Amino acid sequence: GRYRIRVATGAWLFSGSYNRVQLWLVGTRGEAELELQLRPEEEFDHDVAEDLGLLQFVRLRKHHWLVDDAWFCDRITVQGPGACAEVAFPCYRWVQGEDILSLPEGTARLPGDNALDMFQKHREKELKDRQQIYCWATWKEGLPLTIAADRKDDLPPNMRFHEEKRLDFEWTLKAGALEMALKRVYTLLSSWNCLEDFDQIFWGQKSALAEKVRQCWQDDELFSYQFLNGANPMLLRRSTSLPSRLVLPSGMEELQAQLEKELQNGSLFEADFILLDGIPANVIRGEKQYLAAPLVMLKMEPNGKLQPMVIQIQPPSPSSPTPTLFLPSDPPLAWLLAKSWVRNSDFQLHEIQYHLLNTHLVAEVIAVATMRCLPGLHPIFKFLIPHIRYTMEINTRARTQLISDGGIFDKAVSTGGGGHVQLLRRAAAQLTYCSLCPPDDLADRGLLGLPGALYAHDALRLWEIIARYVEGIVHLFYQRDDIVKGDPELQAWCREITEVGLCQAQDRGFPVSFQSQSQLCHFLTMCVFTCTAQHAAINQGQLDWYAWVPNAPCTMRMPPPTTKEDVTMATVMGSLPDVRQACLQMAISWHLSRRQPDMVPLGHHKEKYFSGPKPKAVLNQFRTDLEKLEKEITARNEQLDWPYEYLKPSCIENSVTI
């Protein structure tokens, strides 16, 4: 009866040289008392005369510790006597207090009807404790619920930032600050009267693709290319009909004929920003910002490059029944101002609807429900816990520093001061289940089969690879549909996302319960895609496309133009952001777009929550398929002048952390 124990430690903070942890090896028929000393993997050897049987649980106490001492245990692996296999006890949890921390055996188990089973009692007790430590909160009415944490110190310690991630976050904030200080110094006395004056702040936090954006932002093909493969590829859709808001002033017969012939051809595309209609604009430092709800109509040329046809910056109103329609054949300053207005509103719906709401808040809902309703034994929890890492802290820091009342979003973006909350309320109703699934989303938007849509191709490839991973894990643990229906914790998690997390999203196509393996697989695929790939698609293009502020303004300081002949250089430069708003846009884009040094790639989580070999085989197949997709995307991007790099699996983070 010789037991060999390995204790894995991820992080620790020890005042003394060694610390004392009391250990129990709880089996089916008995338990063994242990004496180990933490010197942080490390190994301990011990013999027990009593026969323990099949080892099931490992219990922990921090024995006589100081209040500043903390310990992040990773996994305890116990090699039993004989030629038996190594038995794994995944923890990946900070150990709080002096109480018993029971670590079940690593084989992921669905709950059963046997209430006297010790795994069932443990998962019920863990669910009760984790429900009373992870709680929902209503940040704003009409929005999906957050974690009950006003600040980052109110968060549970198990999902706090680690030391390297928090120090990187604070260093990047100090970097952005020092940069915008060295830019206020540089551009305090400099004039702001031409588009080349934005080069005075376009330095430092930039890339090669951002430099290409600066060189070619006034080209209409690049402005159209941002709708398909820019920072916001989530808004362009194919027109099945002409929009009702596109009210053509008479004398524009030509344009109507062109729109009709390419609508019946099928090459007509629209990017309707009508969600911003009626949103009150921010007032920054006593200066009133301005908003619009544009509609740009795009044509799919046979060469594979989109081209624009008409920009209607403001929708029709009772005051102005026919708005000014801006064409590329206009005076160039008016067309440039219309394009800048469209790109401004693309920044608005990009950062608010498709980044903050579609990815960050949805992944927060997934994280809170995955904690609250899925216990540590449960296989879907082990599936989702690498994909929900650091999401609650980044969303709490966003709600505290970024999108708060009196925050950065209100000091730089045109929707700040409460208009972004109203836009979030509008977009939360438009947050459908099909919109978060790129097969359904790009089928609704008509972007399937489009050759120039590299985001669509990479999103379908990532969806099928992630769906293969999801189907492998689910078919490992849910062999039948009644097994999916017979899991009360899984349906509780589904209701905690849909009824509770997303504020009764039954009307938006989200499932209230899982009735099949396929439905659970589709929902887990969209959860993992929202947590990793959609966030990488919508979060990495900020520096490449938004560094050049005239390419995509955060705000506009002048009303949209109604006469094309009155648009001069002063009108364009007074409509564009000024030095503070532009520098703050660049700093937030760099801070919320850069590659973290603590970036866990997609599928490459070093934490082993599963213990059986078959989930490791499914994860290895996931990594192999992602490596093949990385090779394919690299081979495609080497032949492209404007490559789409944001959905490379080496550049896709394993969770929404930034």
Q: Assign 3-class secondary structure to 435-466.
A: CCCHHHHHHHCCCCCCCCCHHHHHHHHHHHHH
- Are the beta carbons of 502 and 607 closer than 8 angstroms? no
Distance of alpha carbon 413 from alpha carbon 351, whole angstroms: 10
**Distances 14 to 478, 488, 597 between C-alpha atoms, Å:** 42, 41, 25
* In the complex, minimum distance from the CB of residue 602 to Fe ion, in angstroms, rounded to a whole number: 15
Which string of x and - marks every residue 525-554 that binds Fe ion (by CB under 5 A)? --------------x---------------
* In the complex, minimum distance from the CB of residue 362 to Fe ion, in angstroms, rounded to a whole number: 12
**658 is annotated as contributing to ligand binding:** yes
Q: What is the CA radius of gyration of the chain?
A: 27
Closer by beta carbon to Fe ion, 370 or else 539: 539
* In the complex, minimum distance from the CB of residue 355 to Fe ion, in angstroms, rounded to a whole number: 6
- Are the beta carbons of 499 and 512 closer than 8 angstroms? yes
Distance of alpha carbon 185 from alpha carbon 119, whole angstroms: 63
Where is 409: in which H helix or E strand?
A: helix 408-412
DSSP designation for 556: B
Closer by beta carbon to Fe ion, 235 or else 572: 235
* In the complex, minimum distance from the CB of residue 360 to Fe ion, in angstroms, rounded to a whole number: 6
Closer by beta carbon to Fe ion, 259 or else 356: 356
Closer by beta carbon to Fe ion, 353 or else 539: 539
Residue with CB nearest Fe ion? 539
Residues 6+ apart with CB under 8 A from 137: 145, 146, 147, 148, 149
Instruction: Give the count of residues interacting with Fe ion (CB under 5 A).
Output: 1
* In the complex, minimum distance from the CB of residue 356 to Fe ion, in angstroms, rounded to a whole number: 8
* In the complex, minimum distance from the CB of residue 347 to Fe ion, in angstroms, rounded to a whole number: 14
First to last CA, the chain: 49
* In the complex, minimum distance from the CB of residue 650 to Fe ion, in angstroms, rounded to a whole number: 18
Distance of alpha carbon 467 from alpha carbon 470, whole angstroms: 5
Distance of alpha carbon 190 from alpha carbon 182, whole angstroms: 13
Closer by beta carbon to Fe ion, 581 or else 593: 593
**403 is annotated as contributing to ligand binding:** no
* In the complex, minimum distance from the CB of residue 78 to Fe ion, in angstroms, rounded to a whole number: 40
Beta bridge partners of 42: 7
Closer by beta carbon to Fe ion, 532 or else 539: 539
- Are the beta carbons of 455 and 647 closer than 8 angstroms? yes
Distance of alpha carbon 330 from alpha carbon 171, whole angstroms: 47
Closest C-alpha to 57, from 142, 136, 122, 141: 122
Closer by beta carbon to Fe ion, 344 or else 539: 539
Closest C-alpha to 393, from 148, 163, 159, 144: 159
Buried b (16+ CB within 10 A) or exposed e, 602-623: bbbbebbbbbeeebeebbeebb
Closer by beta carbon to Fe ion, 340 or else 539: 539
* In the complex, minimum distance from the CB of residue 589 to Fe ion, in angstroms, rounded to a whole number: 11
- Are the beta carbons of 501 and 325 closer than 8 angstroms? no
Closer by beta carbon to Fe ion, 554 or else 556: 554
* In the complex, minimum distance from the CB of residue 415 to Fe ion, in angstroms, rounded to a whole number: 17
* In the complex, minimum distance from the CB of residue 539 to Fe ion, in angstroms, rounded to a whole number: 4
Tokens of 543: 């520096």
Which string of x and - marks every residue 587-626 that binds Fe ion (by CB under 5 A)? ----------------------------------------
Tokens of 466: 């992630």
Tokens of 132: 């009373």
Closer by beta carbon to Fe ion, 403 or else 450: 403
The yes or no reply on residue 395 touching Fe ion (CB under 5 A) is: no
- Location of structure tokens 């430690």: 9
293: burial class by Cβ within 10 Å (0-12, 13-18, 19+)?
buried
The sheet carrying 306-312 orders its strands as 237-238, 268-272, 295-300, 306-312, 325-326
Closer by beta carbon to Fe ion, 394 or else 619: 394
**Binding site residues, as ranges?**
355, 360, 535, 539, 658
**Binding site residues for Fe cation, as ranges?**
355, 360, 535, 539, 658
User: Using CB under 5 A as the criterion, which residues of the chain lie in contact with Fe ion when the complex forms?
Assistant: 539
